Design a protein around this ligand. Structure first.
Ligand SMILES: Nc1ncnc2c1ncn2[C@@H]1O[C@H](COP(=O)(O)OP(=O)(O)O)[C@@H](O)[C@H]1O
Ligand SMILES: Nc1ncnc2c1ncn2[C@@H]1O[C@H](COP(=O)(O)OP(=O)(O)O)[C@@H](O)[C@H]1O
Ligand SMILES: Cc1cn([C@H]2C[C@H](O)[C@@H](COP(=O)(O)O)O2)c(=O)[nH]c1=O
Ligand SMILES: Cc1cn([C@H]2C[C@H](O)[C@@H](COP(=O)(O)O)O2)c(=O)[nH]c1=O
Lengths: 313, 313
């Protein structure tokens, strides 16, 4: 019974995630470790034209009063569907090979993913909602479509002080990307709330039970993603969420509950980050594969994906 | 071990689906049968404003050259996400209660759904793609997000001659809906291809194996939904689909393979249709529930959904 190890490096953009993972896989540790990069090519060419630029341009026009929140929201929703498509399809074809968790024993193969489907289906949409370019109903429409959490989903979020983050973000300016410190703050808050949510849920938290507290290491409901959904549009006349929206939140809980989040401190040398990531890896949960041919298949998928959609390695 | 029976009435709009199901449940056959209506209220108010009107207006403007395919596509994608949200969240909270299939023995509860998630996540998006208001990349982004097919998914599609269909469609004109015989033809073709796809796959069809035939009761690849994806935008320089798109098609197959489709002939009296549906029901696959409290819960969900989102019964 060979084991597989999957690690998802996520968190706000411009933090050193791409740099640190490339160093991690740069150790040339044979085939037992494959890195899956961001589908930059899908975003810029295959899925639609310059989607990242479309996003930043759209937020800007909205900020300058050149378009309405309505038009911003519609373009943003469509852009986010394009951003997460390759993440969703990969997770979807990978599901049939993931078996139960096998504790924490060298894994036959290790996959280092650059971001998890939730970045495009939950984290960015939620952040844009805070920026006024997305509606709460849309964010929840994405939440309701988050694929079931597979066993062994180890997500590595990041930690870096705002000032040191801004500096890094200022250096790395992607194609069609515009510096937006507001968006940066919004995304930083969303990811923090996410981490608090996993914790909150794992400590026996039940959002339905704590909801009233909102009205007015132990996170409370007010420090979780659930706060973002006290929006007036979602509240029924009796001051309670419409059931459709309540169910979506139920699904959100079901999805985040079974994830293993790890916090990597990016406030150090790139090599140092690589080491800490490598170290952190030892404590991550592994899983068994459903077929003997699964390992080779999974390795091929990852290689193909990287080759066809990676802007580079 | 109590069994549950789930029936999804789907197919092109304006065929008598709403009429026939209401008659079916109008028999007052106690609690053993609950009807889940279309979330008309979510579409018109809760999710966004007059979404159906938004769709028909948008296609029209595009047909009159008042907007570009690009702008049509963006609004349409966003509208479809709103259309299917309540379908997706319901299926998502219902999943934890559905156990394995129990043959074809009176079911403790029967659920008659008005449409299946695939109508909003696959069928309409594909039809709009044919109408020029949606891109193939977007349709596949929806395909990749279709939730895993639960056991006991009995889908009842419809059969009605075009002329008799048009007449019915001409009578029933929903709020903000515009008569579009082109859209009608496109949706009729999509649903037909769908039925052929389930059949094709169940007879041991493998799209990857038959793909080349496209280049140039036993359906061939050319009579299935796979034909719609020979779009130039999806084809790589070597004349083959980009892997991302090929995988999406893989997921499409995995999803449709395990569905039980039944064809109901609407070319008859409403009572007659009700009888035929009722009759057809006897041969549908049932399933076991995962907990004893599942039946009551499932019954409550359905009742709540209908009450909160049904424009009426
Ligand atoms: N340990 C580090 N210290 C300082 N800057 C770093 C460090 N690691 C990466 N960077 C960088 O900061 C910028 C953003 O890094 P990158 O890895 O590309 O971001 P992202 O988190 O978005 O994947 C790059 O210019 C890169 O030089
Ligand atoms: N058996 C039938 N014969 C003729 N017309 C019918 C029949 N059943 C329903 N209709 C109708 O045709 C129109 C559309 O029916 P409806 O059930 O509302 O459509 P849908 O398929 O979209 O749910 C309605 O005006 C209704 O009267
Ligand atoms: C995943 C994702 C990234 N982005 C943006 C953030 C960055 O500006 C850009 C690339 O992110 P990165 O710096 O982490 O590689 O893509 C979105 O706008 N939406 C998304 O869903
Ligand atoms: C489910 C669905 C319906 N529709 C339209 C078809 C009809 O005009 C209208 C209601 O459909 P109905 O007649 O079947 O009840 O909604 C979409 O445009 N997209 C969808 O995803």
């Amino acid at each position: 019974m060979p084991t597989l190890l999957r690690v998802y490096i996520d968190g706000p953009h411009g933090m050193g995630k791409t740099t640190t993972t490339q160093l991690l896989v740069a150790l040339g540790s044979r085939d037992d470790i494959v890195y899956v990069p961001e589908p930059m090519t899908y975003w810029r060419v295959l899925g639609a034209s310059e989607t990242i630029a479309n996003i930043y341009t759209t937020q800007h026009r909205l900020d300058q009063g050149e378009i309405s929140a309505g038009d911003a929201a519609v373009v943003m929703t469509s852009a986010q569907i394009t951003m997460g498509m390759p993440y969703a399809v990969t997770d979807a074809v990978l599901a049939p090979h993931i078996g139960g968790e096998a504790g924490s024993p060298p894994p036959a193969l290790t996959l280092i993913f650059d971001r998890h489907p939730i970045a495009a289906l939950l984290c960015y949409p939620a952040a844009r909602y805070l920026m006024g370019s997305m509606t709460p109903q849309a964010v929840l429409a994405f939440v309701a479509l988050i694929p079931p959490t597979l066993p062994g989903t180890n997500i590595v979020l990041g930690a870096l002080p705002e000032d040191r983050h801004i500096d890094r973000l200022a250096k790395r300016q992607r194609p069609g990307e515009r510096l937006d410190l507001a968006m940066l703050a919004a995304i930083r808050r969303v990811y923090g709330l996410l981490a608090n949510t996993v914790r909150y849920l794992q400590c026996g938290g039940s959002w339905r039970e704590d909801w009233g507290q909102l009205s007015g290491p132990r996170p409370h409901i007010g420090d979780t993603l659930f706060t973002l959904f006290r929006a007036p549009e979602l509240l029924a006349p009796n001051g309670d969420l419409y059931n459709v929206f309540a169910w979506a939140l139920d699904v959100l809980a079901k999805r985040l509950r079974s994830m293993h989040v790890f916090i990597l401190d990016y406030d150090q040398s790139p090599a140092g980050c690589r080491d800490a990531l490598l170290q952190l890896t030892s404590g991550m949960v592994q899983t068994h594969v459903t077929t003997p041919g699964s390992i080779p298949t999974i390795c091929d998928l990852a290689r193909t994906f990287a080759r066809e959609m990676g802007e580079a390695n």
